[PDB]
From a paper:
Here we describe efficient routes starting from validated parallel and antiparallel peptide assemblies to design two families of α-helical barrel proteins with central channels that bind small molecules. Computational designs are seeded by the sequences and structures of defined de novo oligomeric barrel-forming peptides, and adjacent helices are connected by loop building.
We exploited the Cn symmetry of the parallel α-helical barrel peptides to generate helix–turn–helix–turn–helix units, which could be repeated about the Cn axis to close structures with n central helices and n−1 buttressing helices. Together, these additional designs delivered the de novo proteins sc-CC-5, sc-CC-6 and sc-CC-8. For the parallel targets, the experimental structures show minor fraying at the C termini of the inner helices compared with the seeds and models, which appears to improve the packing of the external three-helix bundles. However, the symmetry of the central parallel helices is maintained. The parallel designs all showed some similarity with natural and designed helical solenoid proteins.
Residue numbers in the entry: -1 to 55, 58 to 225, 228 to 309
The structure:
Amino acid sequence: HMGIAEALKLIAEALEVIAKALLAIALGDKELAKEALKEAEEVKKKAEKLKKEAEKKRIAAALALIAIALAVIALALVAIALGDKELAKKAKEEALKVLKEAEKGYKEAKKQGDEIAAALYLIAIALAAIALALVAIALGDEELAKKAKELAEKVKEEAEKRYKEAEKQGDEIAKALYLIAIALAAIALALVAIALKDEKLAKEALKLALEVKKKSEEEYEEAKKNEIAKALYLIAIALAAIALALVAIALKDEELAEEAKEEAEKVKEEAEKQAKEAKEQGNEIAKSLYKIAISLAEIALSLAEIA
């Protein structure tokens, strides 16, 4: 309850560091990169702290690890911004450590039958593939991009199958979290297409993002008649807009970049509206998630202007 809210706060903070690290890449602004770097290690330390507390007491532990994975992603971006091979190699170590913690926590969450914690660990696995995809870009590592690609395909196939089993359980939060995982899988694929200069894989990631976008939009109005599953469907839509912008970057397509930017503006409006409503009614976890959705729309806009 309280440990969940601390984790969501940190996840929001890390998303702000990622937005800053992204802008530093666009502008070549190294002061911005050093700044984000200090913020991302502050976040990772606080997140590494909350992960021990929640384990020594499960949903907040996976949320703490998500924050760690998001901090590691900001590290990989800063390494791209500064051209720092040492930092990239540090991000590689940090990401594999996340991948190990998220594979173990995912394994026992399926045995224990904890559907939300499993969906949350599966998300952290997808975050690890994203981080590895960025380390591949920084280092020029083809084999690491292939490792990332194979990771993202496993997440996709398993999130799709576990999503249909959450439809048969009436677990709408897990249904949203598995949609988010498929959206993160599309993000990892567009990054690997960028890293490999691969056009067929970007066309693949594009078909995947459009599938998630259509499904998350439908599930969002269905949930509108939860308030948490509602905000999670919005996050999924924001994450799909991020993948569209990435494919607009990888294919050098401007109509796709305009379409990605227009969806990001649409989600932002809806999230601001919903967050206003959740604030007045005291839906603190929902307000947190709508906050997270605005952050993701901001990241999508950054990429959309880079394209």
